[PDB]
Amino acid sequence: EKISGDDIRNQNVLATMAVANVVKSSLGPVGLDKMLVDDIGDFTVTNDGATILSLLDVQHPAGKILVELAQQQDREIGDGTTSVVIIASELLKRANELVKNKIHPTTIITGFRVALREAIRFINEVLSTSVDTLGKETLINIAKTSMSSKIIGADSDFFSNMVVDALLAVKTQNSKGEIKYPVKAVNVLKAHGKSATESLLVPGYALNCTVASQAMPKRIAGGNVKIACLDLNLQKARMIRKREAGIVLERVKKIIDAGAQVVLTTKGIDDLCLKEFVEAKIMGVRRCKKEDLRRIARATGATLVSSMSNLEGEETFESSYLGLCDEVVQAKFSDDECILIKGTSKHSSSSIILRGANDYSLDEMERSLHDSLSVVKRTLESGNVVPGGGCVEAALNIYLDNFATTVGSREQLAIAEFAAALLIIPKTLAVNAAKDSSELVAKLRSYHAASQMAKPEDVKRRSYRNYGLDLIRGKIVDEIHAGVLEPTISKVKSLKSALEACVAILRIDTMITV
Amino acid sequence: SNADGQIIKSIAAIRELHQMCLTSMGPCGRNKIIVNHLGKIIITNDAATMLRELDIVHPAVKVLVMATEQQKIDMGDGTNLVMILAGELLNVSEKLISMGLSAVEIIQGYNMARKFTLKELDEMVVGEITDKNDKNELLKMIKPVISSKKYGSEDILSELVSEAVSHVLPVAQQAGEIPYFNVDSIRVVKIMGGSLSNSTVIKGMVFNREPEGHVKSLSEDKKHKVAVFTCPLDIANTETKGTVLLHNAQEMLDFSKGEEKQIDAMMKEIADMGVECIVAGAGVGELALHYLNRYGILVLKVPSKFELRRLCRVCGATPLPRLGAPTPEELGLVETVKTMEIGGDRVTVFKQEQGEISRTSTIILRGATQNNLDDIERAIDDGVAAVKGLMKPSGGKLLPGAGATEIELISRITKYGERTPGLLQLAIKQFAVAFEVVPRTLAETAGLDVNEVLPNLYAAHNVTEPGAVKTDHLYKGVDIDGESDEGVKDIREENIYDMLATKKFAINVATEAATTVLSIDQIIMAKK
Amino acid sequence: GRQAQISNITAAKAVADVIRTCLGPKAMLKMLLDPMGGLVLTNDGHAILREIDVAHPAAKSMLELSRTQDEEVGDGTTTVIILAGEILAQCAPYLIEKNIHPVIIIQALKKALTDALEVIKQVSKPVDVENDAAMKKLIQASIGTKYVIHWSEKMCELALDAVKTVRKDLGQTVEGEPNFEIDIKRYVRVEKIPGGDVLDSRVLKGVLLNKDVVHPKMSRHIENPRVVLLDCPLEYKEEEQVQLMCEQILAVRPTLVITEKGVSDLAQHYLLKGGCSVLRRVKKSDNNRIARVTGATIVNRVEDLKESDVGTNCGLFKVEMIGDEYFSFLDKACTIMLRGGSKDILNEIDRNLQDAMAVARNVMLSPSLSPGGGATEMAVSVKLAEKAKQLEGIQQWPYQAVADAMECIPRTLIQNAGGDPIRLLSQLRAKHAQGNFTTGIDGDKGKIVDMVSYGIWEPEVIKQQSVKTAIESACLLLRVDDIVSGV
Amino acid sequence: KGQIISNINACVAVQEALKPTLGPLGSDILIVTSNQKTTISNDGATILKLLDVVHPAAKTLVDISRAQDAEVGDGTTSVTILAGELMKEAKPFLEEGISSHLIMKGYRKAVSLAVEKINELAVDITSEKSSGRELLERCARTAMSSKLIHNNADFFVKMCVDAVLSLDRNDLDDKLIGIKKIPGGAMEESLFINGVAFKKTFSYAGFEQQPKKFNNPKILSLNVELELKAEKDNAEVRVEHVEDYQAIVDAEWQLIFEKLRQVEETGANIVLSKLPIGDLATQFFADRNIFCAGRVSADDMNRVIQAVGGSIQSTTSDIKPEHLGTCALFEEMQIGSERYNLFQGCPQAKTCTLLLRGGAEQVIAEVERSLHDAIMIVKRALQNKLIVAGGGATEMEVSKCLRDYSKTIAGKQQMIINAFAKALEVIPRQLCENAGFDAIEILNKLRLAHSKGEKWYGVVFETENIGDNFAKFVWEPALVKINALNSATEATNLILSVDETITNKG
């Protein structure tokens, strides 16, 4: 069968419209999920729109393009799987009136390609480096939205100041000056010494362990101190009796010789080895955690060595495994015992003490904290971010209004329709927010219309930017203060891949099915 | 049978026609176009007129049609309100029918709640109309009746109706036995062309017919003699027999020349007494128009016999079945007769100044659209009909409208639900829910969201006040919005309220309308 | 479109339509027509639902949620579906005709669930968990109308001894406090033992094995046998290798040897002179319970067996035959031994005792009782009407619809009573205001009476999990507004 | 909502018929009436009156066109196109959930702000940079441009200006100027006549007399028939006498001689009537220099009363002597193989006649109607001194101002006013498509200079280009632009306010 003309063009628009109307309910976190039933009769329940298009069975040439569109989006970024489909499907809906206007499809495609490359420089004026770090903190509301579904959201206002200050000191250059934020920082330790509002922040690393004998001072070598991390035990262990005590005896003599003031043993320290540590003013530590010494070696510049496999040599390798630490102090923790490690060469790791009503809640707050920190770490990982919640779609709508007149040649009508096509994303989010969609979309354009009048003049008085939309409270607030941010890399790849899939649809004027 | 939901089919048939009346009441509502059988498009807001033109063989619908006539005839307002209240009682009753409740407790529940509602209406009245009949005072009662039609024109049309009512009501004091206002004494005219600002209030009946003769108008002297002749102008004949027949050509000369001498002799005897006007309800001959030009007598014809009865109370003339007997006792007196241009055409106006006070008034209207003049003309008749309800039987009492009273009565009905033991608790709670349809339709027709107006009305009338005396404002109604910023406003600022005589009388009609439908469990008809 | 939302409510109504008359002790019997010509006459609600073939996919979700509640508690399975099914019925005109956003209804049910749990905590009454006579009328709900009604006096002593043995307070604010810290799975697991009597049945604490002696001549009385656990049995990994493996065990000179796998005849002569019994054929799942009742460290290789094993706290070695079969009695755990006159009787007591102890723990977990027979469902609906006036918001309309669904459970018992539902629900609602929610519904008679006389009470955790799952089941059906097909 | 959507397509179907008829160069529509008479016109009034559509909303667009033709008379085509365009813009708003009530509310605020901008664009100018004679001449060449008469338009303007100046400037009407088509002859040889002229359909004998040169002929109206001939009735008279057969043919000639004698005593030299005049009287009138013409239409007889001040009398007895009238000069032309009668030099004449000549009858019909568009521009120039720039000038700026005012307005009214501003683009569209120009290219190019601050930029109707209509001499009155927005909004508000259509058969 072969069908050409405008009859097959209208069927391709209605086909993509029927597929788009299914995924409009899953857009945004407030959206609704769906069930996919196969021929077997089973189903699944998930709110992620990325896995929906993969398991959805649709027979259509453009339907498989959206499947590859969702697969390409997940391999690059992974966010905006539903938004990229709605934007690409909106251009096909507005193409109906363009056919009756006798507009050639190449001009429609050419008009979009010119506006696509032109909108790239428009984002550069939007995006900017991280600011507003003095006089206020905009990073406290990013994790607050993710913690609102947990008990920790009530006290998150007091806990937000300790999270922001901890992530600023762990920023390093990574590989060749990346200036990113590592996700392995912020060590997690749970102890309950006081009420919930009394939680204090530790600006550095905190190791969980005891001091063994308390007759030794807790503060020594304030100027400089070296920490030696050795998994090798100081106690006799199974593979003549006293021979095993003589082997570890020389291993203790190589400690004072090397000058290590901190001894870390995972299996503990015997009484004979501890007696020599008192007279040498060397604080011993018993029952060290193997997972804790892994990050200490990278923070202090040491290397964890369980056993010596090199020839017959037996010694501690002085100055080779000795870390760099400015000072080590200890204070009363109110029924808690730990060791503080601060002021190393390069740490890139922090520590915080979680505190709650009971350790049972702290056990749940331990694993759930990584999910709350992942929102801030992944957002600040990329140095280029733009406010979300409809700020990108609303800003580009104003710029394309005056730019459509500067080109002409039938491209003014294409840009005018492409600019209004970006307003379907905030309109769909308002449907799931129970608020009137016509009120939020109209009032959003009114604020950005007068905001761009004084923008090129480089002077402003009451005119401000970054007017977004809040779906939770159903009001118009600043997205910078709301804590909703998305990187620019996800913005460029979303709009470029949405139009690329729309061009392949508009270029097919005939469907031949053998 | 009842197993097929026959009681539901009677409600579903009305429910499909229920949405038609929901868009009637209110200025933001919608109107229905109904093509008359004569090939003319007729559209109006009043439902009582549309139900008469629509042919419906359903007797269940006729129950609400006959109940609507009670609001149209006995009252000047509430035709659209009775259709909304009676239509909602059938929908809320489906919850009790599904639970297995007999129709006895449903009817008995509305009867017990009816006496509780009518008793609380006396406490809902704050202010009382003094019946001053002042031009500024009548604008308070007339404005809400004229409203909900042709929105935006209620400001200009308010002064036209309020001025005409003061002219009909005679000056009297401390006498309530004799009636004053008359509904049929006010006739409205319409002519295509002009504008709304050119309208005025004139005392009399405006005649749009041509003068038919060379005399356009009489002089400025007061008390013009006007004679009303029912018998048409013709040659004087004999009451007994007197049939004119044609036999010989010699009689033809006596027929033509005879009519010239006889008609001229009858007009001479009338002109000698000083009568300057002759009113002929029937057709006028050609030879009669020639003699009236020399005698200086105005020619006036009234083909409608309905206006001849109301004319006797204005000028004072009496109709004469015979011809040629100018009785002075049957002659009337009018001060001013002139000819003015109304709507672009020359018409003879009939009015007066001071003497011979008459209860007949006419509101002159102008406009380009012919269909818009029909609704405004019918709105005046419905506006003046509320004057009859201003008499002693609770004519001065009033209650706040526009959704203010319907929401406030909900708190009083639910309070009596838990107080009265027995099975009536289910009917009392559903009785207050049926009143929520009135504010809901006002928000839908105004474009407002359903989720917005409804919770704002409850929070406005429900507050915590540490005291017995109520405070703040209970006058909060349903606001049209479309202006200002957000929220509602006091309805008393616009002087819009529902008269108690309209609301109290509509409750008894709404309950009896839904009672007949719910009491009929079976219907039998024939194919037609 | 909106058609998928209607099918979700219709599918939930079709599932609950069968169990409407299946709620309460007066539930009638149902007849299920199979395509092969068979019929199922059982009146059990959750047993029929597993055989019901459904089409709409939302009907399968109600079957999976009912299966989870069936494993935790024995009753209240049909209560959750009926309570959640009537919510969509009252909210059907609100979602379509009133044009109310579905999340607003879902959010209103979340706030109503919090207020519902507060009312349940207020209507609860204190109960003594240590009283043995008070637990008789409670567990009786799972006792009566069953074969165990005659032995119910002895059945109450068997259930309370197993729950009170494995419970540990350990109250403190440091690591968190489980109330009584009961473990049903591992510790309360019951193994049916044939023969014996039900009246003489006692609760044994230890591990029991039905295997007999593998040697013809052996001492049938041992003072203090010491349990020794091992993984690899005694056999060639030839005569010296088997004896060498025995010398590692005999180093401590044990008086008892228990082998997980079988024992060859060559190893029996080596352990015969050592004065120790040989016991083979031991399951692997029971090895974890043996180490807790003994303390012998489980070790794979025999040469690595530690000497820390102890045979202390061993009651008796007596091998005396019971029920024509040789048994072994070793009596932080317990082993319930059900003795009876046949296997068919013990098979019915098994499921009955497991359901009786599940209800027994329900009282132990929450030391409070709630009135049954529709009294709790009606008392909450009264409090919903009072708090609805103070909300003052858009959620007030869906919040008032909950009270209509709360009154469907007491109306259900009236439909099975035979009286006028409208007449009884009108008078019953007024009795809770001035009666301190002491006015329930009598099933046998059918006249509205107080529950102070009969004393029908149910634990709170069942009422809490019933209203909590119903909201989660009703909201989940509203979460899916569109249904698609295909792989 | 199903009937509301059905009313949308009903307005587009009526609008589609009037789209090609918009503009002087627009296409003409053919409509076949039930009377089997061919009617072709570009005027939207007559087009909608002949359709007689039973649909209630489509009839509303017809009724509002009669009000536009009554109070004004110009713009009956554009008022329906603008009113029906709002039905298409409000179509997608209904499916999105936006009610039509807030849409109708936004139009009242948009038109109220648009009328204020019309008075700002209207500049009163009379004697500034213009003379008395050249003022009305430059306006006639606007409607005559891009026509077949453009070469001969130099001679046609002189006859058009003299037609308006020949009447009182206080009262002017297009129906007062008569136009008679003359088949055959040159177009540049047409002349203007001060008096009244008719078609002269009388084909009978009595030619070669009554010369075209008269001095002071007397005009007298006629009601009954002056000839003795009886067309309808008859009688039977028979005698049995032989010699009486001669005398029984000889009689009737004496009957009307009594009443005919009174006509000679009057001395009326002009005889005109609405009935055909018998051939009997066509001789003796030449001896007395009396002129007579029969088979005269009834519409042309009403202009004779308003010319010399005559009166129609039934009989010849009571005719009064002062009812007679006379002209200054008479002229009769035989061009076209047909004699044409016309009066000249009537000082009391309230009407005139302009004769047109051409190569074919269908060619003159296009020239006559092309002149009517120029007459309305010349007539409304002296009546109303407030004019606005047309041809796309005013239409584009009204849509521009609503875009800036909508930015300060919040709520649904922002997109509603913007939809009304977008609906204003259909007027310049159809003007370009009917003239042959591409509406897509002009729409983009006209908006370029339109944003430079000058509000007078129009569209050139001759050569495709963007520019100012001030040099094109395109003028339009302000009363048409103001009443068009009110009539289109009122007609649209009535259609959108009716959800249910009910029609009862009778």
Swiss-Prot record, chain A:
Name of the molecule in the record: T-complex protein 1 subunit alpha
Pfam families: Cpn60_TCP1
Gene Ontology cellular component list: chaperonin-containing T-complex; plasma membrane
Statement: the UniProt record of this protein carries the keyword Acetylation: yes
Native source organism of the sequence: Saccharomyces cerevisiae (strain ATCC 204508 / S288c) (Baker's yeast)
GO biological process, one term: chaperone mediated protein folding independent of cofactor
Coiled-coil annotated spans: none
Subcellular location: Cytoplasm
Keyword ATP-binding: yes
Signal peptide: none
Gene Ontology molecular-function annotations: ATP binding; ATP hydrolysis activity; ATP-dependent protein folding chaperone; unfolded protein binding
Complex and partners: Heterooligomeric complex of about 850 to 900 kDa that forms two stacked rings, 12 to 16 nm in diameter.
Function text: Molecular chaperone; assists the folding of proteins upon ATP hydrolysis. Known to play a role, in vitro, in the folding of actin and tubulin. In yeast may play a role in mitotic spindle formation.
Primary site of residence: cytoplasm
PROSITE patterns linked: TCP1_1 (PS00750), TCP1_2 (PS00751), TCP1_3 (PS00995)
Family, similarity comment: Belongs to the TCP-1 chaperonin family.
Entry keywords, A to Z: Acetylation, ATP-binding, Chaperone, Cytoplasm, Nucleotide-binding
From Swiss-Prot, chain B:
Residue ranges crossing the lipid bilayer per the database entry: none
Matches recorded under CDD domains: TCP1_theta
Function: Molecular chaperone; assists the folding of proteins upon ATP hydrolysis. Known to play a role, in vitro, in the folding of actin and tubulin. In yeast may play a role in mitotic spindle formation.
Protein name, entry field: T-complex protein 1 subunit theta
Organism listed in the record: Saccharomyces cerevisiae (strain ATCC 204508 / S288c)
Subunit structure: Heterooligomeric complex of about 850 to 900 kDa that forms two stacked rings, 12 to 16 nm in diameter.
Chief site of localization: cytoplasm
UniProt cross-references to PANTHER family, sorted A to Z: CHAPERONIN
Top-level taxon of origin: Eukaryota
Curated annotation (Swiss-Prot), chain C:
Major site of localization recorded for this protein: cytoplasm
Sequence intervals crossing the membrane: none
Keyword Amino-acid biosynthesis listed: no
Keywords: Acetylation, ATP-binding, Chaperone, Cytoplasm, Disulfide bond, Nucleotide-binding, Phosphoprotein
GO molecular function list: ATP binding; ATP hydrolysis activity; ATP-dependent protein folding chaperone; unfolded protein binding
Presence of keyword Cytoplasm: yes
Cellular compartments annotated: Cytoplasm
One GO process term, biological-process aspect: protein folding
Domain of life: Eukaryota
InterPro entries per record: Chap_CCT_gamma, Chaperone_TCP-1, Chaperonin_TCP-1_CS, Cpn60/GroEL/TCP-1, GroEL-like_apical_dom_sf, GROEL-like_equatorial_sf, TCP-1-like_intermed_sf, TCP-1_chaperonin
Pfam family, one: Cpn60_TCP1
GO CC annotations, alphabetized: chaperonin-containing T-complex
Entry similarity comment: Belongs to the TCP-1 chaperonin family.
Function text: Molecular chaperone; assists the folding of proteins upon ATP hydrolysis. Known to play a role, in vitro, in the folding of actin and tubulin. In yeast may play a role in mitotic spindle formation.
Self-association and partners: Heterooligomeric complex of about 850 to 900 kDa that forms two stacked rings, 12 to 16 nm in diameter.
Protein name from the UniProt record: T-complex protein 1 subunit gamma
UniProt source species: Saccharomyces cerevisiae (strain ATCC 204508 / S288c)
Gene from which this protein is expressed: CCT3
UniProtKB/Swiss-Prot annotation, chain D:
Molecular function per GO: ATP binding; ATP hydrolysis activity; ATP-dependent protein folding chaperone; unfolded protein binding
Top-rank taxon, per record: Eukaryota
Record GO biological process: chaperone mediated protein folding independent of cofactor; protein folding
UniProt-listed InterPro entries: Chap_CCT_eta (IPR012720), Chaperone_TCP-1 (IPR017998), Chaperonin_TCP-1_CS (IPR002194), Cpn60/GroEL/TCP-1 (IPR002423), GroEL-like_apical_dom_sf (IPR027409), GROEL-like_equatorial_sf (IPR027413), TCP-1-like_intermed_sf (IPR027410), TCP-1_chaperonin (IPR053374)
CDD domains attached to this UniProt entry: TCP1_eta (cd03340)
GO CC terms: chaperonin-containing T-complex; cytoplasm
Record localization: Cytoplasm
Keyword Nucleotide-binding annotated: yes
UniProt cross-references to Pfam families, sorted A to Z: Cpn60_TCP1 (PF00118)
Cysteines paired by S-S bonds: none
Swiss-Prot/TrEMBL keywords: ATP-binding, Chaperone, Cytoplasm, Nucleotide-binding
Functional description taken from the UniProt entry: Molecular chaperone; assists the folding of proteins upon ATP hydrolysis. Known to play a role, in vitro, in the folding of actin and tubulin. In yeast may play a role in mitotic spindle formation.
Similarity-based family: Belongs to the TCP-1 chaperonin family.
Assembly and oligomerization: Heterooligomeric complex of about 850 to 900 kDa that forms two stacked rings, 12 to 16 nm in diameter.
Protein name: T-complex protein 1 subunit eta
Organism encoding this protein: Saccharomyces cerevisiae (strain ATCC 204508 / S288c)
